[PDB]
Amino acid sequence: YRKLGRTSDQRKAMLRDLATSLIISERIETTEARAKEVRSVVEKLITLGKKGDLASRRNAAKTLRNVEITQTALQKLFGEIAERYTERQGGYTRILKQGPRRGDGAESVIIELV
Amino acid sequence: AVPKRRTSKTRKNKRRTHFKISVPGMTECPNCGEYKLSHRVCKNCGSYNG
Amino acid sequence: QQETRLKVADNSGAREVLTIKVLGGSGRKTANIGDVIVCTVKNAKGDVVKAVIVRTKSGVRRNDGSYIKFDENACVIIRDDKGPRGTRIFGPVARELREGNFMKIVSLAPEV
Amino acid sequence: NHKLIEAVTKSQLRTDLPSFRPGDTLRVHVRIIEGTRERIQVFEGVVIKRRGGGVSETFTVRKISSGVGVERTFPLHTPKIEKIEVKRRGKVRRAKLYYLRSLRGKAARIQEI
Amino acid sequence: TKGILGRKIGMTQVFGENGELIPVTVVEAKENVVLQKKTVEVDGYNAIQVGFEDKKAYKKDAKSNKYANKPAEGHAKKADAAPKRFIREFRNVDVDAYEVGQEVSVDTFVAGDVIDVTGVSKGKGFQGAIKRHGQSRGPMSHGSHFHRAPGSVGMASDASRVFKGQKMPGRMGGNTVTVQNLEVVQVDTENKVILVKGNVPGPKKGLVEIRTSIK
RNA sequence: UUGGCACCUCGAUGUCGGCUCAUCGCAUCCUGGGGCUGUAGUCGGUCCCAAGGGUUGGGCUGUUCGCCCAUUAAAGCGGUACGCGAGCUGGGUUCAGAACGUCGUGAGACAGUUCGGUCCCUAUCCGUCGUGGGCGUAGGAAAUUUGAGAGGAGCUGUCCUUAGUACGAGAGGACCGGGAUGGACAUACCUCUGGUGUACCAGUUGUCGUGCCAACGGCAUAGCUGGGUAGCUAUGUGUGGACGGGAUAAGUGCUGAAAGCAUCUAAGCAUGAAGCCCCCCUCAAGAUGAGAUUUCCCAACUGGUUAUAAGAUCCCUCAAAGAUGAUGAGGUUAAUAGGUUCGAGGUGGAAGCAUGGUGACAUGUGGAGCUGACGAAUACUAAUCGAUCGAAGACUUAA
């Protein structure tokens, strides 16, 4: 979509990592470009979790690391995260610009689940 | 290449005419009471309320 | 084109030709179906002759969106008139050969 | 798909064309007007490619006529093609059959369904 | 002769009355109103303005140009016509329309006429010598360190400077280019589109002004 | 060009030939216009005007020149440090090795010949190519423009008709007029044919994991392979060099004396080039000679000022624009992006199950399932609240 200063599958890895960290923590402080890009990745998994079937669990399992909370991340999604967002039709996140970072000047935002 | 002639301290300052940095483009927070930067979270106290 | 080992679809003893020149205009760099070329026989030889391009891998467009690509390239040697120096043509042959007043060739071909 | 590209080319999309598929085998009829006389010159070959554009969709038919394999690329909605007739239907496992451009004998064959 | 303004929708293709396939550009025009009429008795030439894209009405937030501003609305209210994007002037048409804006429908054009279509070219930023001026490139393999740069930029010491017009890398595309002698395959009224023979300057949704050929 | 001189440079002005890019002269190779011919016609020869455009690809040679091949309308001649090495090469040329012939007693030299042999640089100024800001154009703006001036383009073939007519024993074979269609070159675009397509689909190989089977994930050039959407493209698809004017060169004249005649010239009047100025395409009012048309805005106090108006931005969502800035599309009184739901197109028949096989696997469920850029629709998330800038119009004369 937009290249993130990374190589292709390195970028794939970074996005998978951020989506897992998001649905585990429910809010993460990241860079605005990374947040813009994860916004369109963590929000296509909540759709699969609102579907719920076996095929949806596996399509979600192929874009989601393994970290136990005890639960998994995937049980977290097809379990208790997908139920809270049952009524709204898309728009399951938001970005909040904290501001510039020291050492970078990177635009730091806070992304989260609505 | 190398400079053929050392630069006067007039041409220098003319070239640094545009070496400014603008102000950030800030506002005052209606909640915190102080200056925040527009479209950003308030530094001092908490909320954004947009 | 300008170095291309065409095959000869016409049993004139020559079986392979090297494109030496495309005739027409100063600096023309490519010829297609229905275009006299100068070639030299590489297989049966060693003499300059003028062939026409009966087939082409790139094919033609036919002016209605009908592209006709062929499996390989092929020429047919020509006399001073457009008459083929040989006797029998081989394999298919496109229509634009029929249109450039090569009627003695399209007659002999096995199918157009 | 624009609603304005579409709905202006509705006067060209045709309905008297069967539903063929790559891997199939067609007899296509075409109206030559060469000279001053027209004739319906059949062309019998296996369908190698079928793109899609709506009113810009085309398809390619291949045949090893006699020692020389020739492909021809028609548009579907040409008012030059009279009818397609589907002789056979083959099992091919994919859309564009380009491997047949390097096969002649028992290798450049196709199945029935 | 009454040129129109329009928007390049895309390209498609049709089939003539001999099956002779024609690629054709769909240019859709609508709301062409004639706003002002320039006459030599006040300003030294003859012409007519025409506006094409309707905007909203005047507003007070009005922070995006989707809304007309007050000068634009005075100008368009002179004609009793809504404020419009893309006001353009047409010379070479004998002024026979109304200073009161009447819709110029595409029906002004018949199929068997001929056209020239002005639009800005499509942009391509800072495109270097080989891409921009069709220059050849240096050899790639026989020990050469010259591949895509421009050649020399002058003579040695008897010129002593570069001449104006020297072709160098810079920003490419975006020009007001005109094509000529295009034809009109079909004037689709009631859908309000014109089908031109070819493909016209500009991107999709790029404004194009159609008029009759100067030749 | 081969020289002559030895005036600048030895505290350094880098060689020949190719590559990239050209630009100028005319002593014209082609195309344009003519005179004279020992010009029947076609085809020529020799002069005269003309520099608008065009002027091939290979073999051999370090090579230039030069010969040959195959074309072309033609394959011009020169200058620019025999243009251009802070744009490229480094084949030859004069570095160190080695050898041949020859000369030298010798160390070693070429009339030579042959094989090998480090080509450095981050651009300060002018220059050029793009692109912004400050002020200006006697109020502040938004939009549309005229166009002084500048730039681009400018080439040509072959078929058919006049007509197998004119001219000619015959052979041959046209001028002028009319179309069709090509080459080279510009240019615009992506419908079509192809190319690419590293967040698309499928197949398969090894090995390591998700406890195990099935299903998937990591790494192996993107592991590899078959397709491929948007975009960017050419080899693809459109168009262009048309048509005409005004003045002219060589040229042909018309009238006409100087010169009772003769005379294109002295007065005067015509005709006459691919060339000149127009026409065609573009840029252009910083065109300080700063143009013009329309529309909008215009009050409260102390000679002047103020914030404010119309308007424009800071800030944010973006792309048809883009190195950045700028240009465009929006900022909720909202479809700008993302999500969600439908499509298109792409791949090509998902998992689960059931069935048929002992097994690899096959069929149905089912054109299935997945789908980046493309089209719509939906305020679900985010374009919040805010702030900065920005006039109230000088002086003479004339009507």
Q: How far apart are CA E177 and CA E42, in angstroms?
A: 30
Which residues in chain C have their CB less than 8 angstroms from residue E16's CB?
Answer: none
CA–C1' distance E167–F264 (Å)?
A: 52
E195 strand-pairing partners: E26, E186
Distances (CA, A) of C78 to C21, C83, C102, E43: 15, 6, 10, 70
Domains (ranges, CATH) in chain A?
A: 1-114 (3.90.1030.10)
A54 CB-contact burial (10 Å; exposed 0-12 / middle 13-18 / buried 19+):
exposed
Dihedral angle sign, alpha carbons of residues A50, A54, A59, A65: positive
Q: How far apart are CA B50 and CA C105, in angstroms?
A: 82
* Opening angle at CA E16, ends E15 and E17, nearest 5: 125
Nearest Cα to Cα of residue E34 among E114, E89, E91:
E89
Query: What technique solved it?
Result: cryo-EM
Q: How far apart are CA D21 and CA D85, in angstroms?
A: 12
Distances (CA, A) of B6 to B3, B12, B14, E134: 7, 10, 15, 40
Distances (CA, A) of D89 to D22, D23, D61, D86, E3: 9, 7, 14, 7, 54
Q: How far apart are CA C4 and CA C72, in angstroms?
A: 12
Which residues in chain A have their CB less than 8 angstroms from residue B43's CB?
Answer: 99
Three-state SS at D101 = helix
What tokens appear for E43 in the block? 């300003």
Contact, D17 vs D76, CB < 8 A? Answer: yes
D75 strand-pairing partners: D58
Q: How far apart are CA D40 and CA A109, in angstroms?
A: 70
Q: C interface mutation test: which of D58, D70, D76, D80 has the most C CBs within 10 A?
A: D70
Nearest Cα to Cα of residue D77 among D11, D3, D14:
D14
Side-chain half-sphere of D9: how many Cα atoms within 13 Å? 27
Task: Name residue C112's amino acid.
Answer: V
Three-state SS at E89 = strand
Parallel/antiparallel/unpaired status of strands D58-64 and E84-85: unpaired
Radius of gyration of chain A (CA): 14
Which residues in chain A have their CB less than 8 angstroms from residue B42's CB?
Answer: none
Side-chain half-sphere of D70: how many Cα atoms within 13 Å? 22
Q: How far apart are CA D43 and CA D29, in angstroms?
A: 7
Three-state SS at A45 = helix
CB atoms within 10 A of CB C90: 20
Nucleotides of F under 7 A from a protein CB: 19-23, 54-57, 69-75, 80-81, 83-90, 121-132, 141-147, 151-152, 157, 182-194, 198-199, 210, 215-220, 222-223, 226-229, 231-233, 236-242, 280-283, 292-297, 310-318, 320-323, 328-333, 335, 338-341, 343-352, 363, 367, 369-372, 374-376, 378, 380-387
- Please give, one letter per residue, the 3-state secondary structure of B2-23: CCCCCCCCCHHHHHHHHCCCCC
With CA of B28 and C1' of each nucleotide, the nearest comes out as: F386
Which alpha helices (DSSP H) does A7-80 contain, by range?
A: 8-25, 32-38, 45-51, 54-61, 74-76
Three-state SS at D62 = strand
Three-state SS at B30 = coil
Q: Would you say how long chain A is, in residues?
A: 114
E105 annotated as a binding-site residue:
no
- Put simply, whether C63 touches E (Cβ < 8 Å) is yes
Query: Is the minimum distance from the CB of E72 to strand F below 7 Å?
Result: yes
What tokens appear for D32 in the block? 């030559």
What tokens appear for A64 in the block? 């989601």
At C106, which helix (H) or strand (E)?
helix C103-108
Which residues in chain C have their CB less than 8 angstroms from residue E20's CB?
Answer: 63-64
Q: How far apart are CA C48 and CA C58, in angstroms?
A: 25
Task: Name residue E96's amino acid.
Answer: D
- Residue D15: which domain range? 1-113
What tokens appear for E158 in the block? 């008897």
Q: How far apart are CA D76 and CA D78, in angstroms?
A: 6
Q: How far apart are CA E103 and CA E80, in angstroms?
A: 12
Contact, E51 vs E86, CB < 8 A? Answer: yes
To the nearest whole Å, the CA of E25 is away from the closest chain D CA by: 9
C84 CB-contact burial (10 Å; exposed 0-12 / middle 13-18 / buried 19+):
buried
Distances (CA, A) of A6 to A12, A33, A103: 9, 12, 20
Phi-psi region of E90 (alpha: psi -120 to 50; beta: other; left: phi over 0): beta
Nearest Cα to Cα of residue C48 among C56, C38, C59, C58:
C38
Three-state SS at C77 = strand
Q: Which residues contact E134 (CB under 8 A, 6 or more apart)?
A: none
Contact, A50 vs A85, CB < 8 A? Answer: yes
Nearest Cα to Cα of residue A114 among A26, A16, A15:
A26
Q: How far apart are CA D73 and CA D80, in angstroms?
A: 13
CB atoms within 10 A of CB E7: 21
Torsion, CA E121, CA E127, CA E130, CA E134, rounded to 10: 10
Q: Would you say how long chain B is, in residues?
A: 50
Rounded to the nearest 5°, which phi and psi values hold at C13? 85, -40
At E73, which helix (H) or strand (E)?
helix E70-78
Distances (CA, A) of A47 to A16, A59, C77: 16, 11, 69
At A68, which helix (H) or strand (E)?
none
At D20, which helix (H) or strand (E)?
none
Q: How far apart are CA D88 and CA D48, in angstroms?
A: 14
Q: C interface mutation test: which of E21, E22, E24 has the most C CBs within 10 A?
A: E21
B29 CB-contact burial (10 Å; exposed 0-12 / middle 13-18 / buried 19+):
buried
Contact, C39 vs C17, CB < 8 A? Answer: yes
Side-chain half-sphere of C105: how many Cα atoms within 13 Å? 33
D57-63: Cβ within 8 A, 24+ apart: D58/C65, D59/D20, D61/D26, D61/D28, D62/D100, D62/D101
Nearest Cα to Cα of residue E76 among E65, E87, E66:
E87
Contact, C90 vs D67, CB < 8 A? Answer: yes
Radius of gyration of chain D (CA): 16
What tokens appear for B35 in the block? 């200056």
> How many angstroms is the resolution?
3.1
To the nearest whole Å, the CA of E13 is away from the closest chain C CA by: 11
Chains touching C, CB cut-off 8 Å, 3+ pairs = D, E
To the nearest whole Å, the CA of D71 is away from the closest chain C CA by: 5
As a whole number of angstroms, the longest Cα–Cα distance in chain E is: 71
Torsion, CA E25, CA E29, CA E34, CA E36, rounded to 10: -70
Q: Please name the member of E10, E19, E195 whose beta carbon is closest to the beta carbon of D78.
A: E19
Question: DSSP string spanning C7-55?
Answer: EBSB-SS--EEEEEEE-SSTT-----SS-EEEEEEEE----EEEEEEEE
Parallel/antiparallel/unpaired status of strands B35-37 and C5-7: unpaired
Task: Name residue C54's amino acid.
Answer: V
Radius of gyration of chain C (CA): 13
Q: How far apart are CA C69 and CA C55, in angstroms?
A: 9
Phi-psi region of C75 (alpha: psi -120 to 50; beta: other; left: phi over 0): beta
Which residues in chain C have their CB less than 8 angstroms from residue D74's CB?
Answer: 65-66
CATH architecture of structural domain C1-112:
Beta Barrel (2.40)
* Opening angle at CA E88, ends E87 and E94, nearest 5: 130
Tokens 């068997």 locate to E112
Radius of gyration of chain B (CA): 21
- Tell me, yes or no, whether chains A and D touch by having 3 or more C-beta pairs under 8 A: no
Q: How far apart are CA B23 and CA B38, in angstroms?
A: 12
To the nearest whole Å, the CA of B38 is away from the closest chain A CA by: 10
* Opening angle at CA A111, ends A109 and A113, nearest 5: 160
| Total domains in the fold of chain D | 1
Three-state SS at A54 = helix
